[PDB]
Amino acid sequence: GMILSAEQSFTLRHPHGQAAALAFVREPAAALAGVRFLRGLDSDGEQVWGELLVTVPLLGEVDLPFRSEIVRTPQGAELRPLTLTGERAWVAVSGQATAAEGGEMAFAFQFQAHLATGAAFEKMVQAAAGRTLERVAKALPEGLAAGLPP
Amino acid sequence: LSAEQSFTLRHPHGQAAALAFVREPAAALAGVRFLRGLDSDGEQVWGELLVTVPLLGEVDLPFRSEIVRTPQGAELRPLTLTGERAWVAVSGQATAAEGGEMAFAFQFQAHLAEGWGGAAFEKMVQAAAGRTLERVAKALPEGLAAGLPPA
Ligand SMILES: [Ca+2]
Ligand SMILES: [Ca+2]
Numbered sequence: 001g002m003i004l005s006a007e008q009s010f011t012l013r014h015p016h017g018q019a020a021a022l023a024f025v026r027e028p029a030a031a032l033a034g035v036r037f038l039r040g041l042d043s044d045g046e047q048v049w050g051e052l053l054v055t056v057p058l059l060g061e062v063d064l065p066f067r068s069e070i071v072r073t074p075q076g077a078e079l080r081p082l083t084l085t086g087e088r089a090w091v092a093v094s095g096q097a098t099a100a101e102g103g104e105m106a107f108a109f110q111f112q113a114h115l116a117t118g119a120a121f122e123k124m125v126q127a128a129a130g131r132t133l134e135r136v137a138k139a140l141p142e143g144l145a146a147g148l149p150p
Numbered sequence: 151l152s153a154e155q156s157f158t159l160r161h162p163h164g165q166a167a168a169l170a171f172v173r174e175p176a177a178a179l180a181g182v183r184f185l186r187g188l189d190s191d192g193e194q195v196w197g198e199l200l201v202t203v204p205l206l207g208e209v210d211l212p213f214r215s216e217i218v219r220t221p222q223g224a225e226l227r228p229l230t231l232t233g234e235r236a237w238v239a240v241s242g243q244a245t246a247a248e249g250g251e252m253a254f255a256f257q258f259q260a261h262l263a264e265g266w267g268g269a270a271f272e273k274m275v276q277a278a279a280g281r282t283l284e285r286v287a288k289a290l291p292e293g294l295a296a297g298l299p300p301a
């Protein structure tokens with residue numbers, strides 16, 4: 001299950017404190033936008049959406065959309081993925097974030113690729129999809145850190 | 151990676167109407183299928199064709215064409231899109247003659263962007279794209295006819 005899913009967890013301190021940390025984690029479209037491998041980030045305050053790019057031979061860059069519900073929690077926020085239609089591949093982006101007193105933030109993100117429904121062809125697509133999920137996951141800390149004041 | 155279609159249809163309202171019909175994409179292409187997201191600003195027409203492959207499902211290939219008004223009708227002349235992803239060049243020529251007799255010709259070209267994995271991928275993508283081009287080309291007469299009003 002590690003090919004079509006990725007996981008990333010890390011911490012960052014918000015230098016302006018808990019209130020600033022809470023606000024930061026509660027506006028995901030803006031925070032996620034710093035991750036370059038996420039494209040077309042947008043939000044209406046209730047949900048956030050965008051796309052990941054999977055590069056394959058001949059077709060080139062293939063966009064897989066995602067859309068998640070923004071849930072405000074007592075300690076921060078969560079992203080809960082919405083199920084998209086099955087006619088093309090898509091991604092489920094899940095996340096949990098907390099802000100402690102002093103402004104230290106804890107992040108956990110999970111990505112699941114949902115492919116549409118020979119063996120050689122499937123392995124190539126799955127490999128390309130997996131590389132994309134991992135590239136986004138590994139880039140999350142840098143991306144969120146870019147949205148913090150120095 | 152190419153598909154062609156040519157055919158004739160009579161516009162029930164005569165020549166002037168046939169000229170007007172072929173010169174306005176919103177009229178001529180109103181009932182055309184397999185061109186998703188079709189839109190136009192009067193200068194260009196654009197949309198996408200869907201190539202279905204396993205696991206990725208429906209992959210959209212965009213096209214954009216310039217509308218050119220001619221003495222007997224109009225043409226679509228394709229614009230070059232980037233190589234970052236597969237795309238389609240949609241060309242077409244239409245003429246309206248005495249009595250409302252219309253002639254159409256359309257041409258489509260799909261522009262695509264090692265090992266067992268790579269050989270399997272190429273085979274499946276070329277075949278799928280070929281099917282997409284033929285499906286849209288073969289349905290064009292039906293689609294154009296669907297845009298025509300009764301006498
Ligand atoms: Ca993984
Ligand atoms: Ca990991």
Ligand SMILES: [Ca+2]
Nearest residue numbers: 062063209210
């Ligand atoms: Ca697309």
